[PDB]
């Protein structure tokens, strides 16, 4: 009712922040200048999921569909199954619940039915191997996701089971100042209804890129054989570099388009991985907001994290503007002492907050 926003910008993030804040919000003039102005099927399903795993939170959408008012309640959770509509994938619906996992009355066991791949949104293995490490370093213990059947575009037929048990008061505050040394690189190429020869082709392209390096590099193959192979054919490949000492992770991934060179896809994922490593500073451009919001929701205490000049960008700016417009909270930034680069230490006081929805 009070915190006002315009347009369709960053809708999921704004809703998640509204839930964590308790401040009632109204977002209006949603894609008004369009031939089909209003909301989307995936967006309304997202709101349905929000009501499902919340309790007593009131959500209404004006008949014009360009003005949504949200009055948040509490975050119950529980165990349920959602059927993601065709246009958008399970990782896209999972990331917000991934944000909301560790602070709920009943643990999270959600079965998502549908598609598990997109150039747009994060793959299941991508989200696992990238985000699970970040949240667990912040202080969650049992968060995992299993794959009963894996879908593909555009038929879907995939089943993912998110089980998150760790209910924490707050993530432990973080003070990361340095640059982790990359320990090794692993990855995986998955194939649905297509050739192991194709798998080997893409892995050959990847290792051709990665032969310039000397530390450990391993990528596994997953032919999702048989009944749970979904319906449409497809394939994809993911790559993650790891720093065992502090245990950090950075990653990039892709799927195979229609009429594409699997070797090219290999050099693809390799090149995005390398480039993200290049632009990284103790954290990766896509998991930036995840760690940011965790360290913000941390307890009443300043927290420190190294970030990159290049990592600072439009998406960072809009995240900062939104998080300030919600929490009335501003992030201090000070340059690194070392001159060889211009890394920036971000400090921010995690707000006084508790897992007041917990069962004691």
């Amino acid at each position: 009712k009070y915190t006002t926003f315009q347009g369709s910008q960053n809708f999921r993030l704004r809703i998640v922040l509204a839930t964590l804040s308790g401040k009632p919000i109204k977002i209006e003039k949603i894609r008004s200048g369009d031939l089909n102005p209003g909301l989307k099927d995936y967006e309304v399903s997202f709101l349905r999921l929000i009501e499902s795993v919340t309790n007593g939170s009131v959500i209404e959408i004006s008949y014009t569909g360009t003005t949504v008012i949200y009055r948040p309640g509490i975050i119950v959770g529980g165990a349920s199954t959602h059927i993601c509509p065709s246009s958008k994938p399970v990782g896209y619906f999972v990331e917000p619940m991934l944000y909301l996992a560790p602070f709920s009355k009943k643990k999270f066991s959600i079965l998502f039915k549908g598609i598990t791949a997109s150039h747009n949104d994060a793959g299941i293995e991508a989200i696992k191997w990238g985000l699970m490490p970040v949240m667990e370093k912040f202080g969650v213990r049992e968060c995992a996701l299993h794959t009963l059947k894996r879908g593909s575009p555009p038929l879907g037929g995939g089943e993912v089971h998110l089980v998150v048990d760790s209910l924490i008061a707050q993530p432990i505050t973080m003070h990361e100042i340095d640059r982790p040394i990359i320990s090794s690189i692993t990855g995986v190429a998955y194939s649905t209804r297509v050739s192991p020869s194709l798998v080997n082709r893409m892995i050959d392209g990847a290792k051709k890129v990665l032969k310039n390096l000397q530390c450990e590099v391993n990528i596994t193959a997953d032919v999702w054989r048989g009944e749970n192979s979904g319906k449409s054919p497809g394939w994809g490949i993911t790559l993650v570099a790891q720093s065992k000492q502090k245990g950090w992770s950075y990653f990039a991934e892709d799927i195979g388009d229609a009429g594409s060179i699997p070797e090219e896809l290999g050099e693809k994922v390799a090149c995005q991985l390398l480039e993200e490593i290049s632009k990284s500073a103790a954290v990766g451009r896509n998991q930036l907001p995840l760690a940011i919001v965790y360290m913000v929701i941390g307890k009443e205490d300043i927290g420190r994290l190294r970030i990159n000049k290049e990592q600072i960008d439009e998406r960072f700016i809009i995240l900062l503007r939104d998080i300030k417009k919600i929490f009335n909270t501003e992030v201090f930034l000070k340059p690194v002492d070392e001159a060889d680069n211009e890394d920036m230490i971000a400090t921010i006081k995690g707000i006084g907050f508790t897992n007041t929805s917990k069962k004691i």
């Binding site: 960053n10 993030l13 804040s21 308790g22 309790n55 007593g56 309640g73 509490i74 990782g91 896209y92 990331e95 009355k105 150039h119 747009n120 949104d121 994060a122 505050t173 003070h175 640059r179 040394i181 990359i182 310039n212 390096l213 990039a252 991934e253 050099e267 090149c271 995005q272 390398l274 480039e275 490593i277 290049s278 451009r285 896509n286 907001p289 009443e300 205490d301 300043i302 420190r304 600072i312 960008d313 439009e314 998406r315 700016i317 809009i318 995240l319 900062l320 503007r321 300030k324 009335n328 501003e330 201090f332 930034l333 000070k334 006084g352 508790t354 007041t356 929805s357 069962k359 004691i360």
Partner: protein, 682 residues
């Protein structure tokens, strides 16, 4: 050898009695905010006489007509705020127990332990124990040293019982000349000035402060235009305590007996009665009392009249008119739903990645003391990054760190408040949390208070202290039915905890709360008052909650194992709904209800266990749900004029008494003695 053994058990046990559970302090190092002491006791003792004499000694200045808080310096780091609680307002007692940290508890000697004092002791104990120190007054009236000594030891022993043993008390002779014996006044002064404190969760998790100075802001012309009914602007002056309060307007703050008013404007002012180190460092860089609403020197200000005796990427980011694009272009000199970020064309990526040297550049003892070390290290990090840069950090993001005078101005304030305000009552205000602002139903567990006479009743109003608020609601007492359902009771079990659930303002679990009957001095009567104590333990927006109703029926024709039951129902519809179900005759034999009948309209047939007698009464268990009443009423005592004998909802006993009814009673259900004769068979 033997001494070695004995002293090692000494060492082990004493360390094992030394250690504790760690919790953070957040507390101010540079400038401690004042510590709060409250004179607490019954009205016929002379607390005023005590406050006057003690403050005069400490400050080296006399004073008459004390009222409201009064703040003084002692030590080279010590400033204290003295509060004389009234012996009338149970609510004021409650607020003092919420906020104050040293309680100067003064008790009659000619008469021992009035229950008001005992109740303050209980409620402080409940909301988090503040350091207590008692003084036995009126020892001079005892006309024999025998009685004086006996009562001395008696008092010391009861006190030692009800608070930690060893808690010495100070004996106070008499008020000769508006004064207390100076030497024992030194005892008190030195002691409480060298007192040591503990961290408590309430203090150290919510930013709280007592209101020092009271002013109103309204255009007088606005007043006559509106007609005195216009909510009045209000300005409060005070210090800070415990948790660093935020610095930007737009947060919510409770005020006792007032309501819940958001912060409109706030400004930081240097204190009026500063530390001697503060003064000396002031002078080094360049080269006592305070009690706003009570008299100081020889002058007291009224509302207007007075009485006197005769004698930069960061800022670019945080600016709004700038588009983020113009931010970035100014700085080097899209939405997020697309999860993977932007990139470069594939050929340029590949060619620039043919070189990889730039990427090999990046590429390859007591546990208690241990977590106390983590706490200390985290706070020292806080300190260094706090000192890093003041004008943005200190002023804004650190909020207003504790120990800094503040003036805050608000709107929508009751005309009645500003008009019938009196200084004699304390006035408190502390930060609300999101959980403490959202509402719902609290699931708590509580017991009657053990010195109380009567047991509480479900759906009977009940005031309670919980969070800064203090308010009356209608609980519902539920006992889990050996952990299957949530059956509702109809009374509290008379000597144990039991679950309760009621609508109210939410708050974090594992939080103590303490509930009371009438607050009105008019009806305090002669008994104890504090009635329930418990912990709020979870919060929600709805709960399943059950009451047990058993449908009674009778048999009217009996075969071996079969029966026709005649009054558990009245319609074949109904019996068809309930058929194939499970019943147990009062005798304790099971059976199932099986088929409706026709020519009688509500009678059915059951297949039992053995030949069920005509002289029985069959029953069928069933769970109805119950709906929690949503009554909610903050007390607003200080909004009221007389500031006591506030009356919310009355209790069923005095409701029946008032409207002159008689208690419902199921006669045949009332108990009676049964004499079953001895039975024989053929």
């Amino acid at each position: 050898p033997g001494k070695m053994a004995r002293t090692m058990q000494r060492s082990s046990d004493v360390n094992e009695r030394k250690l504790h559970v760690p919790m953070v302090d957040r507390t101010p190092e540079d400038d401690p905010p004042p510590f709060i002491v409250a004179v607490v006791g019954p009205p016929g003792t002379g607390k005023t006489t005590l406050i006057r004499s003690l403050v005069r000694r400490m400050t080296k200045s006399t004073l008459n007509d004390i009222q409201g808080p009064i703040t003084v310096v002692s030590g080279k780091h010590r400033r204290l705020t003295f509060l004389e609680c009234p012996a009338d307002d149970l609510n004021a007692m409650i607020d003092i127990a919420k906020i104050a940290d040293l309680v100067l508890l003064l008790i009659d000697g000619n008469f021992g332990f009035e229950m008001e004092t005992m109740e303050f002791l209980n409620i402080a104990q409940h909301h988090g124990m503040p350091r207590v120190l008692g003084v036995a007054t009126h020892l001079d009236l005892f006309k024999s040293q025998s009685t004086l000594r006996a009562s001395k030891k008696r008092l010391k022993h009861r006190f030692w019982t009800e608070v930690y043993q060893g808690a010495k008390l100070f004996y106070l002779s008499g008020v000769i000349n508006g004064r207390y014996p100076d030497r024992e006044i030194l005892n008190l002064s030195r002691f409480i000035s060298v007192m040591k404190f503990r961290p408590l969760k309430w203090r150290n998790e919510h930013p709280y402060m007592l209101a020092d100075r009271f002013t109103d802001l309204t255009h007088p012309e606005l007043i006559e235009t509106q007609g005195l009914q216009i909510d009045r602007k209000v300005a409060i002056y005070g210090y800070l305590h415990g948790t660093p309060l935020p610095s930007a307007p737009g947060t919510r703050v409770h005020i006792a007996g007032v309501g819940d008013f958001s912060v409109a404007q706030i400004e930081k002012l240097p204190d009026p009665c500063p530390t001697p180190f503060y003064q000396q460092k002031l002078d080094d860089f360049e080269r006592l009392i305070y009690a706003p609403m009570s008299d100081v020197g020889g002058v007291l200000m009224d509302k207007d009249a007075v009485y006197i005796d005769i004698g930069n990427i960061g800022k670019l980011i945080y600016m709004d008119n700038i588009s983020p694009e113009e931010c970035i272009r100014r700085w080097r000199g899209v939405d997020l739903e697309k999860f993977v970020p932007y990139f470069d064309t594939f050929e340029k990526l590949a060619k620039k990645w043919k070189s990889v040297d730039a990427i090999k550049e990046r590429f390859l003892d007591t546990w208690y003391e241990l977590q106390k070390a983590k706490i200390s290290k985290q706070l020292e990090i806080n300190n260094i990054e706090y000192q890093e840069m003041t004008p943005e950090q200190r002023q804004r993001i650190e909020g207003f760190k504790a120990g800094s005078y503040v003036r805050i101005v608000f709107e929508k304030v009751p005309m009645e408040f500003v008009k019938n305000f009196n200084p004699k009552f304390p006035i408190v205000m502390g930060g609300l949390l999101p959980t403490e602002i959202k509402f719902g139903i609290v699931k708590a567990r509580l017991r009657r208070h053990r010195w109380h006479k009567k047991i509480l009743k479900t759906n009977d109003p009940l005031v309670l202290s919980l969070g800064w608020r203090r308010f009356q609601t209608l609980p519902i007492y539920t006992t889990t039915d050996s952990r299957t359902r949530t059956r509702m009771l109809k009374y509290t079990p008379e000597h144990t905890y039991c679950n309760a659930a009621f609508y109210g303002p939410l708050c974090s679990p594992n939080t103590p709360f303490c509930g009371v009957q009438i607050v009105a001095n008019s009806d305090t009567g002669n008994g104890f008052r504090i009635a329930a104590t418990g912990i709020v333990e979870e919060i929600d927006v709805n709960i399943e909650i059950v009451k047990k109703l058993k449908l009674v029926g009778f048999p009217y024709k009996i075969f071996k194992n079969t029966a026709f039951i005649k009054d558990m129902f009245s319609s074949a519809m109904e019996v068809a709904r309930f058929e194939g179900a499970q019943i147990k005759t009062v005798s304790g034999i099971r059976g199932e209800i099986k088929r409706a009948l026709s020519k009688p309209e509500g009678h059915y047939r059951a297949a039992f266990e053995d030949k069920i007698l005509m002289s029985d009464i069959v029953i069928l268990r069933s769970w109805y749900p119950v709906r929690v009443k949503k009554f909610y009423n903050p007390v607003t005592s200080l909004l009221l004029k007389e500031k006591t004998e506030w009356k919310g909802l009355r209790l069923t006993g005095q409701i029946r008494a008032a409207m002159n009814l008689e208690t419902p009673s199921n006669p045949d259900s009332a108990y009676h003695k049964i004499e079953r004769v001895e039975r024989h068979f053929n």
